[PDB]
Amino acid sequence: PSLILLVAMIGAIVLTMHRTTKVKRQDVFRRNAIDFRRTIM
Amino acid sequence: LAVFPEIFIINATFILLIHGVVFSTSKKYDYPPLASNVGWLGLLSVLITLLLLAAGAPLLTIAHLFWNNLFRRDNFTYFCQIFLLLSTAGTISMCFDFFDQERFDAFEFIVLILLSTCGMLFMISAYDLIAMYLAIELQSLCFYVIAASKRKSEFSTEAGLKYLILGAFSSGILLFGCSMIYGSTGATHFDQLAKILTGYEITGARSSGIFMGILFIAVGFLFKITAVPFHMWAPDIYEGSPTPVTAFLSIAPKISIFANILRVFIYGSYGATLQQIFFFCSIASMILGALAAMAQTKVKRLLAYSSIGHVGYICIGFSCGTIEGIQSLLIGIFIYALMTMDAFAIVLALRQTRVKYIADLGALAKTNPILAITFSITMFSYAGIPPLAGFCSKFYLFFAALGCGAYFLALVGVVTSVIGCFYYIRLVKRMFFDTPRTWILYEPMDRNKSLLLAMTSFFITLFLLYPSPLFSVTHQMALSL
Amino acid sequence: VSEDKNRNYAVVAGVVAIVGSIGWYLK
């Protein structure tokens, strides 16, 4: 049951983090050298 | 000692969980996706365990402190646990594509698979209703979580939700069975419950508490292994959830719950009184497998119903308590697991498709023809075509059913297996000899699926040429029970 | 005539693996 409470913690985290932290708050992840500056759409 | 397979895979999961969480939440490493890095170390924590578990074969029974309290390891638990870690090894290996290609930074899916594998390692060696339930629910809870993981597509969320409902209700039934049995016997340890339930003869001796208890335990289990009268969501569970988590909760809980059934129903309670429900479940499971497989389109749901039907073909080995029957059941789990790991490795190789049916599965005879050969091999294996391994599984199961005098069970098995053979031969023909049907092209599979598909395809075709090791293993496991 | 840390460690550990395993299948 210790492991089951740990799995409940991991589960409530991976489920209901809701993209509100490093799950997606890392960055939009947009880089410059990989862009074409829209001169050619 | 004696918990070194558990002590390790629990420490390793913590080392991976802390290592993964520290890095994924790290500005210095640009918040990297720790999947496929806590993986790789995940599946090695499996192999090092499988090495810690296989080596200490006499050492697993090294203490008594565990015996009459917590859990009893023996040759059956040892061999079936080397299998669970091996079948968890395949399941993590096939996912490596699902981590990189599919955008998953969620590494803790790995550490949850590892915690579930520890829960299953404690299910196999579970030797007390309390331990059986606790390990069952540890693995079922890890699997509810990792089956409700994908939060973008709503299709996986409701699938995981009905999986949680079905699993929690199945566990409630199983637990009420444990309650009735304990309440009517005052003993939960299988070593204690065995002494009471010798000469119980429910249909002849009035014992309603123990009867309803064993019935509810059998119903909870037949829910967990998604047998026919209680599957009730299993097709939608396998279809909606992502493909690798389906490959996990579709092959490993079967192995584990079936080993647990062999423990409680062949040692904890041994009588022809309870296996009647499993006989009925076998009949209707082979029936439903055959017919619904004839009816389905979506390859994920087709594999769902095929797995239900094959779980049926398993329980005919339990529908008679003879050593030949139990050994047939064990042969059937190994040849159903390796074949299912193969089918799911194939379904995972075709990541490019969305939820698509056998028509979109077509053209594989043209694009990647060796993968089509492998897929036909696996589907034949399910059908039971003689020169393959699934035939050996179904044939030894039917021979045990005949030697056990259940001639009608063998009859329904053979008619359902012939229906399945026809359906899968027709499927292979439709895939190979006609029906081009829109030619969806696939990114290539990675080495991890490649070796697992290749080794398993070799195992299925070159099995009858050497069935001695597996037959010896399963007969030793049956004797040990 | 040099390298970076955290990779030469990895190559030394890979050498330790194959040398160690040789000793294993050798014994």
Place this chain on the structure above:
Amino acid sequence: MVGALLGLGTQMYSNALRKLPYMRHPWEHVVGMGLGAVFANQLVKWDVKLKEDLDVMLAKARAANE
């Protein structure tokens, strides 16, 4: 033994499934499968030994003709 041929196939079959040609040094790591086949046959022998032991234990059990 036959494990050597099987491994070269497992590796080549793997290459055939990823679309890659049938070429590289892993075909020389199929010697590991030759080691695996020898171990599997060795485990067959060990296993039938243990099963004969369990079978004589069973023969001792089951009322021992009484």
Place this chain on the structure above:
Amino acid sequence: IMEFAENLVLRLMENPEERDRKAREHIYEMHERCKKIKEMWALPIRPYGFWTFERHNAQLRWDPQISQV
């Protein structure tokens, strides 16, 4: 003839023990007919692993009247 047809036939010879082969096969299968009839009979073998702990730890706690006197 052709210089060796005589000894060209001694590539088999009678060696008639292959019937004792089936003789002892039959012993095999006469025993094997006891494959499926056998099952659990022992309640005296180590599955009686409870008392060896009960007698072992009964004195420490969970005891009615020993701690009294």
Place this chain on the structure above:
Amino acid sequence: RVKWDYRGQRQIIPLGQWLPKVAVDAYVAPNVVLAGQVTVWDGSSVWNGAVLRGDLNKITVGFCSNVQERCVVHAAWSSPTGLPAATIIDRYVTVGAYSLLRSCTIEPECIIGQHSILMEGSLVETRSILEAGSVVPPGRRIPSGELWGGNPARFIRTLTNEETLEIPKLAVAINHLSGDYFSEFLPYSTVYLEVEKFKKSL
């Protein structure tokens, strides 16, 4: 700017998130120039000198769909008139020698013969053989199974179904040749060794 780059010419030239990914078993002859968005698919064969550029849209050759020697395949900006004009050379299409393509969406099982110039929106229908020098104006949907040709893309003949059955055999024969060539190249190259020996001469 200086000339004679030691690198030669990199045959796979990405730009702005656009990698012309080559699927394996696709012999991309070393002279070619992939650029922008050119998704060549399984079993394809981009032969000598065949450029494949990249615009707002994306080139894509299909299964077994070879682009033979010295064949330019570009795409117009958007051409939103009737349909988005992203060249899709779909399965088994044998774009023959020294042809030319732009924003046309060829259909399965064609044979775009030698020196056959094309243009936008020329959806050459399925199972269609084009004669040599098959020049096409924008929009001329060459219908199914119909042999064509002519400088303004004038129809010529409909084809017996035996030739239509033979077209896949020609595509897979080209693919056999492509595999025979793919067995001539290795994953990485040995050019770097020569370049290092050049640098150690400096």
Place this chain on the structure above:
Amino acid sequence: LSGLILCPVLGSIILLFIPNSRIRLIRLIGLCASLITFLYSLVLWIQFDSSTAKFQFVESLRWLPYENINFYLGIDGISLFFVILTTFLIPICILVGWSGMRSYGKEYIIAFLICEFLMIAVFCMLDLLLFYVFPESVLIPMFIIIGVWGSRQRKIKAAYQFFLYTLLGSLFMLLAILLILFQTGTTDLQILLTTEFSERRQIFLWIAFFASFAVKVPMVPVHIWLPEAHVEAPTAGSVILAGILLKFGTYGFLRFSIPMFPEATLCFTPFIYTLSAIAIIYTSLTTLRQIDLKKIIAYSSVAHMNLVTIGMFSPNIQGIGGSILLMLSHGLVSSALFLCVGVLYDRHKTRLVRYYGGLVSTMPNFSTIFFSFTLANMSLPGTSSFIGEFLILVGAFQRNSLVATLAALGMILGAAYSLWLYNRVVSGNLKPDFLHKFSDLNGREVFIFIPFLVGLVWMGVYPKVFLDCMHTSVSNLVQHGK
């Protein structure tokens, strides 16, 4: 036999590591491996002693320890030349495929999927469980041979309800095999011979084997799979089908019906009598209705095979000798006719039958050889098939000759339509639309014809070397049926 047994599997697997687009090597070496396995089959023939109830070259390897259901490999009597015919015929399929490119028909794939001697296995396999695995097992190789390089006449398929019944019948036999296996632990065929069953159950087990067999055997209620399987089969898929896959059912009856269930066989003699009789009558009259050449030869094959059945019944040593020798002569004659009709297809590239005309101008040597084998499929007295069929007939030896009187119609209509169809094919200067493309036969073509004509004549003028090497075994079988 110990080492010389596994020639085709070793050859196939060690060639699998030679993809080799340049076909010459794979063709050459696959053909050499086939020819040497045939050479070892024939030296195994020479190795035979026609004097023992035991099986000639017995070998085994443990397959599952308890009850030891192991690869028990005997070649006495009938199996001796059944495996010989198998090998005799497999290089024929390897040799009908010297096609130049053979590209879509990837040559190494057909080499590897014809060079599987599971037919050798089943004919030597002498424990009816693993023996069961093989005829059902050869269906996976047969299905790929039947359509992957097979001519596509329809969306390739078999009657689905009939196919489900055919495989259901095969698995029904499996339940019977297990019932006998656990009936007295009897693993293999020697001890299934020795043992004795309940007469009440012998009949059930007999008909349960008979389900799968009489599907493999083309009896009247279920035989439709031969025509539909052949007209789509490739040139070398029919040569194997007629050659061996029909012998499967009759050899199954021979080994695992007659000396297995003597009382059940005694009881069901009239059953198989009438079944095979009416089957021969039907398949004799049918080629009236059928104009398709492949269907014609397939139905003549049904006729001959139900003659094999109407003869295998007997405790007549002559009876079962005629049965097995009609099997040999049939694996020669129907496969030679399938070779014929395949050459006649390819040289004409047409799949109508009214279109084969002016053959004496295009390929007159094909006319000669086509007669040399259609006289045989009607069993010209003098041919091998005559010795076979007339020992089938005299099979009414201890009998009272009432089923020979139905074989009357069965064979008279057979010979009649044999001559009618040989005419219909070679008749007249019926000018076809082939654009003066004569397509004279090849030297390799007349070669692959050579061995069938040679076996046919060598039997038809001298059946001793085959009736000998057999009599001891069949007579032992009969006394166990006594």
Place this chain on the structure above:
Amino acid sequence: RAFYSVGFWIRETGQALDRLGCRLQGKNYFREQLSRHRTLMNVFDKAPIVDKEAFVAPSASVIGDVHIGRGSSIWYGCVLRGDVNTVSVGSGTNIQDNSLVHVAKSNLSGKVHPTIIGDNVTIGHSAVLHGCTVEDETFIGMGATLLDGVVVEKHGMVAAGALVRQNTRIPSGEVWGGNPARFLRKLTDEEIAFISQSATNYSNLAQAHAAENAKPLNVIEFEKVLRK
């Protein structure tokens, strides 16, 4: 120890050299993936004064006497052999892929006529400008074959695959075409609008092919494309 493992670099040279000991079954592998290709300038006796902003594709062997204007491109695989007679390219003339802008020595009568291509001249893929002068702001067709002395007037597009015979200098706006030198039509004004649009867009598109001249460090740093 590491860096002294160059012995495996030396060991590789052995197993690699083993290609010589293995090229005996027939004369095999005379190719070695060599280094020298005197391509991007290949000055015969006159040098190109191509600008610092005129993107030439490293495949384009611009031989001998050539001059390209600021903003004009010389696309992939287009040989420009200005070896016997002068060549020139105005600012914005995008000589597209597979071109053959190699001039002449003569053809049956003198006709030296150094090829001069003006500004904004969108030349098509696989074009063959053997010996014609081309005027400003015209759009030659992909596949065209412009023969000796064909003064392609301004804003007059040549059709796709449109071979033009000798001396048949097209008029302005007259869209030419056909295997023989015949006119087709006078399309529209939107035609010239799109000509200029495609010219400037191809100019800035060639200015987007700066990755073609990236450095090893910059190539492997673009290989970060996996992360994004």
Place this chain on the structure above:
Amino acid sequence: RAFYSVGFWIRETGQALDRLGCRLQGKNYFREQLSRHRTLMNVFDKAPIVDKEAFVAPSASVIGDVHIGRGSSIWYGCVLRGDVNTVSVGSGTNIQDNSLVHVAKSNLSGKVHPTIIGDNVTIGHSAVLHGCTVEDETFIGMGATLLDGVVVEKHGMVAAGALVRQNTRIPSGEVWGGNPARFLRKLTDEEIAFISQSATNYSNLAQAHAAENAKPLNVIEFEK
């Protein structure tokens, strides 16, 4: 070829051993996407043979069985891709540019025959000669195209943009310059002088162009 395949295997293991058995020590030199078309004379079990006085341009690939004689030239971008049957190019020919000479493999639909190019043949740019037994002192035009089995006889000046048809044995000295192959005019003698002198013109222009060097200053610049 079998031993050729084995050679491919030993070389890969060798290249790999260098690539990551010694470039492991800080070297990404192997990873540079350098070109491979510089295999001008790409090879098989059959190889391309070329004599001394035969300029081959480095922008041009010469694949398959080739027999480049004396004076012949393969200028910038050409592809003498002739795997199936030998490209038996004669002496003194002049491909001149991005032309193509194919016996390129099909499904034997027309039994592709070798391309025996003659002598002093000044083939023009973009010509797509394909299974062409073109004889000696012949001219083929700019942007041209040919088809299977063609035999351009002596002095047959095929014109620009032309598309000669299959198996058409063009007569000796007949000018065919159209998409449907069509004789147009008996060639004049001044054209004969031009075609027989442009042969030696390029013969000298190809002995020129003197690639045969290296440009390290540019290599040092492109290094930085």
